[PDB]
Amino acid sequence: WTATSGSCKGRCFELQEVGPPDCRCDNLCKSYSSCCHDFDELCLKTARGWECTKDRCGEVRNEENACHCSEDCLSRGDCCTNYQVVCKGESHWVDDDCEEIKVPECPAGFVRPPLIIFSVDGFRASYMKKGSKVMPNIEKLRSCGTHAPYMRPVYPTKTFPNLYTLATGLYPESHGIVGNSMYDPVFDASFHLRGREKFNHRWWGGQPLWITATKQGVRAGTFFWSVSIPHERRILTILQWLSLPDNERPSVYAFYSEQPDFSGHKYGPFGPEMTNPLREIDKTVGQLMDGLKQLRLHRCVNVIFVGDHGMEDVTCDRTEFLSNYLTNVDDITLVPGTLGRIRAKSINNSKYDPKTIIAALTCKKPDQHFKPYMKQHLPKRLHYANNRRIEDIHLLVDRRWHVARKPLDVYKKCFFQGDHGFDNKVNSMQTVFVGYGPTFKYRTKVPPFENIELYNVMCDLLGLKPAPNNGTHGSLNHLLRTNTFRPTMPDEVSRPNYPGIMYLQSEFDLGCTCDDKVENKLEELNKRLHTKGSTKERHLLYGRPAVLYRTSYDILYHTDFESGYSEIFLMPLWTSYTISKQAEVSSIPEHLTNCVRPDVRVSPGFSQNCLAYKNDKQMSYGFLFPPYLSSSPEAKYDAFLVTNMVPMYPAFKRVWAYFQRVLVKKYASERNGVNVISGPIFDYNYDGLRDTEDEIKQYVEGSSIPVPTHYYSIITSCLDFTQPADKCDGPLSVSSFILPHRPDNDESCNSSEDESKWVEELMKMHTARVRDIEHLTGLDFYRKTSRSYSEILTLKTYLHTYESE
């Protein structure tokens, strides 16, 4: 019920929302069907349009008009945005030369520069260059302020997940808005774009920026706007709030445009009909900037122009149908389109089996345009699994395609030419970032970054402490002139032991053998020095990683590599080695094919054993430092130590051996040397975070050797590739991966072919940030470099995406 007989007199676009049954006057009342009877008349005036004309200048105030051109309008805060241009001889903001804003130039009574977020739906990154001739206001913000060539959205690349990620700094799996449509099985409730369930606060987790501000005594505008409020009135409303008295006036605001998304769905991303919507958005930016200039705020406010996601070419004829794969198609519910999510149609059907659905969808047609996954097997960089609202079965859809259940779903619902939602590394899904104002840098270009990082910066801009989030605070300090956040490196929790030779060979009963019984004072002192760390500066280039949790581990030194060996997990947490451009690749000699050697620094009780691998018919083993890259025949014996061994499915050994034998050397040739850090990851509950011992679901048969869910590598070199990796004076360059440790290669449809046709393609799909590996391992990397900590934070968030320009 609503008692719509109240009135909006003196309450238009009120900031405090009122409780039913009392009628509402706020910027969402229309969406709730709750506005007072007189809201249109009083709050949505349109008379005489949105621009002053020569004949209106100095008019007698008429309160019926949409905006004003009378002499009293500046003190009332309600002039048309072009008033000073038409009536007082001023220039439009876009026509003024740009001039560095070195300090905030704010009216008396402003305690801090306000922040205005101008958000645009569907604004693809390439529009900034391709549309620049028709967007002069936007082009000025871009060239004069701080800009990235693009900003990476979160997966799925849909509207609600991305706007709420911008507002919270959280991945969708943590904030709870995991699509535009959702079913929550604990609530037994469905969330949709249309309708009222989405207004229930239980869907929306974390803490959005407007709440963070309000809790810390910084007042906020209401961010949301009902679709029927025209853009001109949204801008006039912001400008009027900015004229409130000091104690009532907000410091943070948002504008939202449904364009260019709305037209992009109809016409495709570059349809000739797209020029007009871009023109219209630019005009809206111009109205805001002219309006700020009238209020003497144009060199006081920080403005962010940001998009949620891009737009791709997608038509009805590029649809794959599950009815062409499944016998049982009526026993499933599909969330369809640019991703798929599958669950049982009925919880009472005991003949539902996910294994058989997955198998019927795997590599069945030669050009198949989607790939099925159990959600825990999705690339870790997507962070798309730890939420009961994400269905176990997921379909990753190729760019330009849709998936649907049956053909009748597509013609009883071609209309559309654009859509979005695909993998967030796809070029067409990238969106925009520009920052302009006293707190941003002047004429500065910054590298691409992820939208999860912006909440921290918006908090910095307003002097707020951010709520706990998935950004890396300090990684975007290079965007800011002032208000930088200066973090300290985390303290190491566990210090290592440095074991010497403590065990005789006969103390070990591991069931291992090696043909190594082959015998010098020159070379003996030498090998002793290598075991005490004499080559460590070559192989550990950025210091040892720090262990940020409580555990027992040993540092082990060798000629060609250094490791941190866990006594609890019975394997290295990390293994570090450097491969120069000149390094040579060799084979594993015939006599050493099955060689595994006891490590006399590490007790039998804290070692793996060969017998377990023999008896486990599914599990084999591999090595973290590759025997192929040994510096000499004698050093090669170190690579077969039981302390360098890790458990590997034979199917995974195909991937790992090609990485180690072919790819590492290729990268050293291309990059002028590389430093490699490799290791295991355990994430059995798919939360993106290091497992404790009691979370491990699988062991090598009959032993306490835990099986990793994934294997990582971090590959570092000099950004100036004219210097070798091991003698680099300046910034670094990195690429990393987190490969799933699977007992089959079903993910790779071309795996019966030679590794040269499919392994590198797998690795590119599973590209990762250093920071992703940090979360998964409890390790902290790059502790000892010549670089500033903020620069290192930026390096740790880099993602190598393998898309062209």
Ligand X SMILES: *[C@@H]1O[C@H](CO)[C@@H](O[C@@H]2O[C@H](CO)[C@@H](O[C@@H]3O[C@H](CO[C@H]4O[C@H](CO)[C@@H](O)[C@H](O[C@H]5O[C@H](CO)[C@@H](O)[C@H](O)[C@@H]5O[C@H]5O[C@H](CO)[C@@H](O)[C@H](O)[C@@H]5O)[C@@H]4O)[C@@H](O)[C@H](O[C@H]4O[C@H](CO)[C@@H](O)[C@H](O)[C@@H]4O[C@H]4O[C@H](CO)[C@@H](O)[C@H](O)[C@@H]4O)[C@@H]3O)[C@H](O)[C@H]2NC(C)=O)[C@H](O)[C@H]1NC(C)=O
Numbered residues of the known binding site: 121, 159, 180, 261, 265, 308-309, 420, 683, 685, 687, 689, 691
CA angle 83, 89, 90 (to 5 degrees): 70
| Shortest distance (Å) from residue 250 CB to ligand XLE | 14
| Shortest distance (Å) from residue 5 CB to ligand XLE | 24
Q: Which stretch binds K ion (CB under 5 A): 48-56, 254-262, 618-626, 711-719?
A: 618-626
Q: Which stretch binds Ca ion (CB under 5 A): 108-116, 570-578, 643-651, 680-688?
A: 680-688
Of the candidates 705, 643, 717, the residue with the CA atom closest to the CA atom of residue 677: 717
Residue 231 touches which of Cl ion, ligand XLE, Zn ion, none (Cβ within 5-8 Å per kind): none
Catalytic-labelled residue, pool 81, 146, 157, 159: 159
Q: Should residue 685 be labelled a site residue for Ca ion when binding is judged by CB under 5 A?
A: yes
In the set 560, 616, 638, 726, which binds K ion (CB under 5 A)? Answer: 616
| Shortest distance (Å) from residue 492 CB to ligand XLE | 36
| Shortest distance (Å) from residue 332 CB to Na ion | 24
Q: How far is CA 325 from CA 314, 322, 344, 418, in A?
A: 22, 5, 16, 26
Q: How far is CA 114 from CA 91, 208, 431, 671, 709, in A?
A: 23, 17, 24, 45, 47
Q: Which residues bind ligand XLE (CB under 6 A)?
A: 28, 31, 117, 119, 160, 163-164, 166-167, 198-199, 223-225, 254, 256
Q: Should residue 307 be labelled a site residue for Cl ion when binding is judged by CB under 5 A?
A: no
- Contact between 13 and 26 under an 8 Å Cβ cutoff? The reply is yes
Q: Which stretch binds K ion (CB under 5 A): 166-174, 391-399, 620-628, 654-662?
A: 620-628
Residue 691 touches which of Na ion, ligand XLE, Ca ion, none (Cβ within 5-8 Å per kind): Ca ion
Name, in order, each residue with C-beta under 8 angstroms of 282's C-beta and a sequence gap of 6 or more: 134, 135, 136, 137, 138
DSSP string, 513-533: --------HHHHHHHHHHHTT
Among all residues, whose Cβ is closest to Na ion? 751
Give how far the C-alpha of residue 116 lies from the chain's centroid of Cα atoms, to the nearest Å. 23
What stretches of 693-749 show up as alpha helix (H) in DSSP? Answer: none
Q: Should residue 469 be labelled a site residue for ligand X when binding is judged by CB under 6 A?
A: yes
Give how far the C-alpha of residue 522 lies from the chain's centroid of Cα atoms, to the nearest Å. 54
Q: Should residue 312 be labelled a site residue for K ion when binding is judged by CB under 5 A?
A: no
Q: How far is CA 242 from CA 88, 115, 165, 280, 462, in A?
A: 21, 11, 26, 24, 16
CA gap 275, 516 in Å, rounded: 73
Q: Which stretch binds ligand X (CB under 6 A): 94-102, 142-150, 438-446, 687-695?
A: 687-695
Interior/surface letters 653-692, b for 16+ CB within 10 angstroms, e for the rest: ebbbbbbbbbbbbebbeebbbbbbbbbbbbbeebbbebbe
User: Looking only at residues 334 through 393 of this chain, which bind ligand X when binding is defined by CB under 6 A?
Assistant: 383, 386-387
Of the candidates 344, 32, 384, the residue with the CA atom closest to the CA atom of residue 177: 384
CA neighbours within 13 Å on the CB side: how many for 289?
24
Q: Should residue 771 be labelled a site residue for ligand X when binding is judged by CB under 6 A?
A: no
Q: How far is CA 473 from CA 31, 130, 450, 488, 788, in A?
A: 36, 33, 13, 11, 14
Binding residues for 1-hexadecanoyl-sn-glycero-3-phosphate: 159, 180, 261, 420
User: Looking only at residues 169 through 228 of this chain, which bind Cl ion when binding is defined by CB under 5 A?
Assistant: 179-181
In the set 34, 82, 174, 735, which binds ligand X (CB under 6 A)? Answer: 174
**Bridge partners of 303?**
116, 436
CA gap 662, 381 in Å, rounded: 25
| Shortest distance (Å) from residue 596 CB to Ca ion | 30
Give the nearer residue to K ion in terms of CB position, either 7 or 620. Answer: 620
In the set 27, 137, 157, 159, which binds Ca ion (CB under 5 A)? Answer: 159
In the set 261, 460, 638, 683, which binds Zn ion (CB under 5 A)? Answer: 261
| Shortest distance (Å) from residue 651 CB to Na ion | 9
Binding residues for 1-tetradecanoyl-sn-glycerol 3-phosphate: 159, 180, 261, 420
Q: Helices 275-294 and 136-144 meet at what angle, rounded to 10?
A: 60
Q: Should residue 652 be labelled a site residue for K ion when binding is judged by CB under 5 A?
A: no
Phi-psi region of 268 (alpha: psi -120 to 50; beta: other; left: phi over 0): left
Give the nearer residue to K ion in terms of CB position, either 263 or 608. Answer: 608
In the set 455, 613, 682, 781, which binds K ion (CB under 5 A)? Answer: 613
Residue 409 touches which of Ca ion, K ion, ligand XLE, none (Cβ within 5-8 Å per kind): none
CB atoms within 10 A of CB 698: 14
| Shortest distance (Å) from residue 179 CB to Cl ion | 3
**Quick check: is 81 catalytic?**
no
**Bridge partners of 339?**
396
Q: How far apart are the first and last CA of the chain?
A: 55
- What does DSSP assign to residue 576? E
CA gap 346, 352 in Å, rounded: 9
| Shortest distance (Å) from residue 376 CB to ligand X | 14
User: Looking only at residues 697 through 756 of this chain, which bind Na ion when binding is defined by CB under 5 A?
Assistant: 745, 748, 751
Q: Say how many residues touch Ca ion, by CB under 5 A.
A: 9
Q: Say how many residues touch ligand X, by CB under 6 A.
A: 18
Give the nearer residue to ligand X in terms of CB position, either 387 or 566. Answer: 387
Q: Which stretch binds Zn ion (CB under 5 A): 259-267, 583-591, 674-682, 716-724?
A: 259-267
User: Looking only at residues 60 through 79 of this chain, which bind ligand X when binding is defined by CB under 6 A?
Assistant: none
| Shortest distance (Å) from residue 472 CB to ligand X | 10
Give the nearer residue to Ca ion in terms of CB position, either 337 or 626. Answer: 337
**Bridge partners of 334?**
342
Binding residues for Zn(2+): 121, 159, 261, 265, 308-309, 420
- Contact between 405 and 321 under an 8 Å Cβ cutoff? The reply is yes
Residue 616 touches which of K ion, Cl ion, Ca ion, none (Cβ within 5-8 Å per kind): K ion
Residue 737 touches which of ligand X, ligand XLE, Zn ion, none (Cβ within 5-8 Å per kind): none
Q: Should residue 790 be labelled a site residue for Cl ion when binding is judged by CB under 5 A?
A: no
Place of tokens 């440095």: 498
Q: Should residue 683 be labelled a site residue for Ca ion when binding is judged by CB under 5 A?
A: yes
CA gap 279, 257 in Å, rounded: 13
| Shortest distance (Å) from residue 417 CB to ligand XLE | 23
CB atoms within 10 A of CB 359: 13
Give how far the C-alpha of residue 187 lies from the chain's centroid of Cα atoms, to the nearest Å. 28
Residue 261 touches which of Zn ion, ligand X, Cl ion, none (Cβ within 5-8 Å per kind): Zn ion
Which residue ranges make up the site for ligand X (CB under 6 A)? 170-171, 173-176, 205-206, 383, 386-387, 468-470, 687-689, 775
Catalytic residues: 159
Binding site for Na ion (CB under 5 A): 745, 748, 751
